[PDB]
Design a protein around this ligand. Structure first.
Ligand SMILES: CC(=O)N[C@H]1[C@H]([C@H](O)[C@H](O)CO)OC(C(=O)O)=C[C@@H]1O
Ligand SMILES: CC(=O)N[C@H]1[C@H]([C@H](O)[C@H](O)CO)OC(C(=O)O)=C[C@@H]1O
Ligand SMILES: CC(=O)N[C@H]1[C@H]([C@H](O)[C@H](O)CO)OC(C(=O)O)=C[C@@H]1O
Ligand SMILES: CC(=O)N[C@H]1[C@H]([C@H](O)[C@H](O)CO)OC(C(=O)O)=C[C@@H]1O
Lengths: 388, 388, 388, 388
């Protein structure tokens, strides 16, 4: 009934409480579940949904052969309430795409599915199901967006789309949609920044996004912008390196990509800035995508220290992990006066790691809570391989 | 809450954006999906549904043996939201029939399922589930309707039903239903016109329908009628032949069926008239039903030229295609002031082409959008045959 | 929002139009469908549902072994919208029982599931899910009710429950429930009447029910009662014998059971009285339950003639049939001023007839319609046996 | 629309009527059903749901190997309407936990899922899906709650959480939540009381809970508390011993745990106090968890007699049983002026008893009803083992 308003700070967060695990892949052992990847959560006022880029096939099937590759005319974005296995039975259709992002402005959903050829892909802006606008690749190299939730404030929604090479320098645009209508955009001038798959969240008029450098950064690049899109960038000061792969935590930088041989690649991640401090979600292995923890250098957003301030384990480094996102839960839903930060973790299974013919993922998600919390490990839990 | 009103022109269309693909058949590889064929989309104010003539069985089953033939006491029309696999779980029942058409007048659905013996079939008019009227075959040779969406304007809905031989001359009626009540009908006087499986859409008081000549036309027959049903017919002037099979594009006619040896048969198709121009959806092969593109002779509706004005590829001619429809999205849904034309393509799989014991189809759908667009190929994607 | 009112005559009925077929069993070939039997339809103002007595198992399963017998602590009554396969996915729970009846008073559903031991069974009155009342067997021999829809008028609902031997004389009660509360009941004094599994329908203050004599009647016993329950009985005058088994149509009686060797048994059936005439639904075989047609002696309700007045075939006698019911569609739903009579036919498959380890059923349903109609045969369509 | 109010007595109960059986496990024979355990019902004003602690896998699957053990990062609490098989298709997600309790305050649901390591588990308070509060283990030994429904009165909800050894003395807290916000708590001082898995219900300002002594009680411990939490404890006076295992009914105590060699263990149970009398639900075997009946010593709550006053059989001791719960149905739903007591019985299948690699459970539930009733046996009904 009412729109998500602006001007609200990320509530106090002492520990992450488990919101929901979905055993997607475990149920797919013998159930009718979609082969997935690239999942992420997003809430509106009443319903919180899990979105995902379907490989257009179900687990334990001959059509799941090769689900290791991203992009195909088959890849389709779809939603489902949190915690439930994403099956053709509860899965609602959202868009045709192999990369995308969706958010809500409160009472309605915005869906940005980017499908089409590598050479000249197209974003398709849908609002509550209806196509409302489009955007075509401008640099001609895999236009691609967040692969996570976008943020909306006062009728207006924001996101970020990259387009360039994975190799080195690419190009970045900030959109400002309103009812699915692209009402403006700015070309970000970030020399030496590889920006892509951003994990955003609103923070008082502003919109803060921590993303990934898949060019030469072992730390994360960030970007905070206006209602008009006047930006501000750099990387996360902290030495508790978030990317992956990443080197042993050294002294970090706050404006350049810390290479250290490992920077060269990366994986989607998030982070919440709390003043001078910042909560950092990161994998435990430094070479592979396994395990997952939520750090806490309180000097983190401004200091290059490597000294952290406390860790809550989420997945021991004995199990697999993957894409880490970061949606938010507004104060229109919560009787509260501050936005609640929450995050979900994708546990990838199958290739290129495990000896299977398929590659999909599971998921879990925790929230803010300024109460008590315990750590652990809530992995996928699939006994692999399958009836392959 | 409000009725679909009349007097609205097909919005400006620069390129077709992908609305939704459903991997129906791919999910049926191991999922619980209905063996289908004859699908088509249709929207109302809130929900857009996909309708289809079920073979009364599920894919990869012994009861899917022979799904190649149309018509049976088993064939049943059913709906489901767009993009989702049409399974016994999300599929809603609509009518008993092996041919039909359904539309909305805005707040409610109209369903016309025609079932019964070849010799004396019956149409059954249901409105929001309730039987409201009926119509029996009058010429005694497979009464059959659109096999696509019908159009409604100002409480009143319109459709077209054929009844005659596939061989040559058949007979055609224009209905005018209101709340499922057949409030009038006209016998179309079209000497030398094989009219059937019409793809309609509203265009300002009027109702334009491009159909198929399965008698001796390699081009498409059309028909525009009133609120009172005073019609106007002929074929599409353009030389960019729409039927299939069809001969190489020669100089076309605008009132007679261009035979050229191939005319003899055909397949359902659509087309949107934009003044002197017209958007033409057609298969790439000329002998088989494979591939699919959306043409654009701007002189097309009035000129017999074969010179076209631009092509957006939808399915390379390397994959299968099939029935091509053409629903519309009114301006009551879209805040806009003009109806948005959209179309769906059926990709048929199995017989009579492929070495299987079954025959079903998948689907995709794109919309207007006066923005940018890219072409490609979004085929079914089923690795055939099956566990047959 | 409004209650089903009384005082309305069964609309004019020229022919039966097909409302819905569900290929229950055909989809169960490989789908997740419930092993059923004893189905029947029932509508309320918005939704029409199909109810059924589940064998507490799914088709093609080892737990479907013996589904030939009625009654078990497993048998559970459940609903689902018309036309859809009754699967654990769309099937809504209704009650624990191996015999029952449910109806609506317009805005709410009444459910009467009778479960428990043969010796001392209990009816359980639930209204919109909540238990509201109960009734225990009074004669101690399988208390059992309609096994079809009951009728409600002006806040009040009515049904019929038998209790006695199948062998000969049993006992019958007429209930009068209101919001699931049994507000009165009468003991029917029908010497020489075997009354059970009644197919009812409202007809102007009154409630007419045609049932079955499984004692010594080859024709059907009827019963019309008041708002206070003052009854009137006898059998259907007509010579077009409805029971099954039944002898060749001879001259019938209107108050006694016509034995003729075959009377001894029977199967549920229905019939609609239209003044002096009456529509009769009956099987084609006289020894088995196969085929199904809808007769029409217009002198039928009062005359003992065997001369009929027209037949619409529903299922050739080459396929199986079974329980035949008879719900109604009120005028609160239909803008009309008269109730619309409709009926559903159960096609039983498996034992004791076919060489299977299971026994379930499918269904179809047609309605009034004072328009044109065609006959045919819309059988189950299952290729048996199964993966048994 | 309106909150569940307080001050209402458990309506008169002559016999238990069957509300719903779900053949969970039987449908899982070949259906897509969740491997479950720890189920229990809970109603709100409109919908009654069944909740359960999923083993994060489906029956007849390799991932159901070991479902015999409680607790795992996979165990997740989920709901579904009563009577339906708890499958990934109708099962709604509720929380991440291997122990929990949920209730309604009328218009909304409260969910308390306790997940995490044995050493330091955490309760997570969610209200209508949103995390609203948390509580961490305080004694560091499997914090665990009711494993059944909690009670809410006048905006406020109540429950009970244990934390200590199964061996002997543990510790107990009474919570008082309001909109998921823990607004107070009391540490129960029960020397010599093993309190856990309480079966509660409201009874006029007060909240009565009968639980289980898994330390040295063969009878059940109880606890009645205020709006402020001023408690009162002891055990059930009656000699008709409720725990299990339990010794032959001797003369009972009303404040201490009756050991008798068997007390040492136990299984969840319930009981409703009706003045000086009390309805007792208990297993028939004394060593195993098989069969189930509902006793009635009318002198029971105050007298140590072993003389009972009537038994209604629920499951002969030839079949398996398990956890027995006890939710309630308020008078806001029932037009009535008194709360209706109802109970559900879990029939466990598989290990440690049966020769299977899995362990799950089915369920049934009956209600108050001051009418007639019959006894019987409505067991799971699964033919074991499975395709194991
Ligand atoms: C649009 C697209 O292909 N995104 C892909 C992304 C991308 O290649 C990289 O960020 C360089 O731009 O990488 C990965 C990956 O984790 O292997 C999966 C994504 O689907
Ligand atoms: C009612 C009916 O049978 N329609 C059929 C239609 C028809 O035969 C033809 O248009 C000549 O009238 O052809 C085809 C077809 O593409 O093979 C499938 C349809 O189901
Ligand atoms: C309650 C019950 O068992 N009803 C059964 C009914 C009954 O035995 C008969 O009407 C004599 O009373 O017969 C049949 C039947 O068609 O074989 C199935 C029913 O389930
Ligand atoms: C949190 C937890 O593990 N609860 C378990 C409970 C518990 O161990 C016992 O009550 C001693 O505290 O016992 C049992 C059981 O019937 O075998 C299953 C429960 O899941």
């Amino acid at each position: 009934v009412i729109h998500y308003s602006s001007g609200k700070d990320l509530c106090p967060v002492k520990g992450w409480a488990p919101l929901s695990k979905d055993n997607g892949i475990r149920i797919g052992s013998r159930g009718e579940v979609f082969v997935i990847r690239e999942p992420f959560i997003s809430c509106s006022i009443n319903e919180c949904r899990t979105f995902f880029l379907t490989q257009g096939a179900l687990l334990n099937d001959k059509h799941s052969n090769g689900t290791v590759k991203d992009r195909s005319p088959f890849r389709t974005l779809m939603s489902c309430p949190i915690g439930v296995a994403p099956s053709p039975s509860n899965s609602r259709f959202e868009s045709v795409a192999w990369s995308a992002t969706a958010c809500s402005d409160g009472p309605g959903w915005l869906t940005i599915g980017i499908t089409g050829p590598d050479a000249t892909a197209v974003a398709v802006l849908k609002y509550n199901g209806i196509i409302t606008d489009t955007l075509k690749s401008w640099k001609g190299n895999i236009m691609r967006t967040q692969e996570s939730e976008c943020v909306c404030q006062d009728e207006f929604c924001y996101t970020l789309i990259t387009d360039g090479p994975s190799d080195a320098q690419a190009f970045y645009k900030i959109l400002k949609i309103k009812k699915g209508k692209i009402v403006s955009v700015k070309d970000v001038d970030a020399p030496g920044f590889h920006f892509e798959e951003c994990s955003c969240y609103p923070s008082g008029e502003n919109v803060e996004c921590v993303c990934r450098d898949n060019w030469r950064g072992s730390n994360r690049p960030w970007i905070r912008f206006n209602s008009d899109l006047d930006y501000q960038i750099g990387y996360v000061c902290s030495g508790v390196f978030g990317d992956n792969p990443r080197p042993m935590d050294s002294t970090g930088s706050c404006n350049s990509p810390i290479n250290n041989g490992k920077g060269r690649y990366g994986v989607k991640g998030f982070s919440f800035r709390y003043g001078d401090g910042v909560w950092i979600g990161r994998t435990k292995s430094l070479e592979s995508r396994s395990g997952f923890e939520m750090v806490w250098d309180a000097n983190g957003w401004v200091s290059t220290d490597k000294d952290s301030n406390g860790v809550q384990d989420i997945i021991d480094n004995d199990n697999w992990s993957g894409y880490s996102g970061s949606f938010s839960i507004r104060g229109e839903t919560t009787g509260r006066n501050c936005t609640v930060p929450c995050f979900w973790v994708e546990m990838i299974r199958g290739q290129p790691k495990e000896k299977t013919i398929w590659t999909s993922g599971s998921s879990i998600a925790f929230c803010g809570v300024n109460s008590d919390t315990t750590g652990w490990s809530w992995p996928d839990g699939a006994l692999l391989p399958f009836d392959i």
